[PDB]
């Protein structure tokens, strides 16, 4: 249970093993699969409808940011393509880090290299995830598997299903390190299916506990 963070907008909040001890060990073998609740139409859950992966959830799920419109300079002022691209950049920051950064923290080179068509949205979020700021905020201060779990939620928009995903990312962490774990998550097939080269990741699934936290209040 300690490896489940709060499903809040931003922050990696885990129960601390020693502070108000609450540990609830359970024997999950290597093959269990965690039941997740889709943020959208229930029938679009990829368990029952694996080809639904990437189907945008509409009003039942989160807002989805896409670089659908053209990028500026793909001279003249009042070019309308400046608001959409910047809204997407700030959305990507809010997705990878949970919230917007303070002044001076944004990866400006990556932003211009994205706004100039030199990279894709996927490449930019990879740069954000591999940034030293992400390492300091979300990788370094945590148990390795807590860091991986929070990473998975931010990048794939869902908690991990079980020991298969967890073990592969954890093994990469053992062998290669943080950048390689980020690479594995963003280069995985499911990322490509759910998010192309032009979609900012978003919350796609919740645990029962997170949904209950959100929807059980008076």
């Amino acid at each position: 249970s300690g490896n489940d963070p709060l499903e809040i907008q931003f922050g990696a909040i885990f129960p601390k093993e020693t502070r108000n001890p609450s540990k609830r060990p359970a024997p999950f073998n290597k093959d269990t699969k965690r039941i997740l609740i889709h943020r959208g139409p229930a029938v679009n859950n990829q368990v029952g409808n694996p080809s639904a992966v990437g189907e945008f959830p509409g009003s039942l799920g989160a807002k989805v940011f896409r670089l659908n419109g053209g990028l500026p300079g793909a001279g003249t002022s009042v070019k309308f393509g400046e608001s959409s691209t910047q809204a997407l950049i700030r959305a990507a920051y809010r997705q990878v880090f949970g919230r917007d950064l303070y002044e001076g923290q944004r990866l400006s080179v990556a932003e211009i290299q994205l706004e100039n068509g030199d990279i894709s949205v996927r490449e930019f979020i990879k740069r954000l995830a591999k940034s030293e700021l992400f390492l300091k905020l979300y990788w370094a201060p945590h148990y390795v598997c807590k860091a991986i779990e929070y990473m998975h939620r931010r990048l794939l928009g869902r908690p991990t299903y079980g020991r298969q995903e967890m073990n592969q990312y954890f093994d990469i962490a053992s062998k290669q390190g943080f950048y390689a774990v980020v690479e594995a998550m963003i280069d995985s097939k499911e990322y490509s299916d759910a998010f192309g080269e032009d979609t900012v990741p978003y919350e796609r699934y919740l645990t029962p506990g997170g949904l209950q936290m959100r929807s059980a209040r008076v």
Binding site: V43, S59, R90
Partner: protein
């Protein structure tokens, strides 16, 4: 609702509502009388709308109400008219809200799965909504009919 749509867009953008969105909300709230009048008209004459549209549907698609048809018999036909009533009520929700979201969330997400399970022909459900749209448009001014037609068409297209 338009208010919910604008708030969701702003929240996902981590900003306050833009002046355009605030002006859209103003235009929606100040035009509330027309929407509520359209809803009143649809609610008051719901029985005749459903009855006439059901008769037109049955005459146009006799198979669904004849032996072997999904709606054959008294009970199944009554259930068919009840489904039509459900959708007219949902359309009232949509016209009052100024937004098709209540209709979509209450009666169109997974509708094909449900009607395929039941064996109902979805094309006929769409045609029944078409009949109800025609009958309802008959009972109000052209402006009001044009207003409610967008929601009727949303429902029809989601089944077509």
């Amino acid at each position: 609702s338009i208010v919910t749509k604008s708030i969701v867009n702003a929240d996902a953008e981590a900003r306050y509502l833009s002046p355009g969105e605030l002006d859209r909300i103003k235009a929606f709230v100040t035009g509330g009388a027309a929407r509520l009048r359209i809803a009143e008209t649809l609610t008051g004459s719901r029985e005749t709308i459903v009855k006439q549209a059901g008769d037109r549907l049955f005459q146009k698609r006799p198979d669904i109400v004849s032996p072997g048809g999904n709606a054959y018999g008294e009970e199944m036909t009554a259930t068919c008219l009840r489904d039509m009533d459900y959708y007219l009520r949902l359309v009232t929700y949509g016209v009052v809200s100024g937004d098709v979201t209540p209709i979509e969330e209450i009666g169109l997400v997974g509708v094909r799965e449900m009607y395929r399970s039941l064996g109902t022909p979805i094309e006929a459900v769409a045609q029944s909504v078409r009949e109800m749209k025609e009958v309802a448009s008959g009972l109000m001014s052209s402006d009001d009919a044009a207003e409610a037609s967008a929601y009727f068409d949303f429902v029809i297209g989601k089944m077509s």
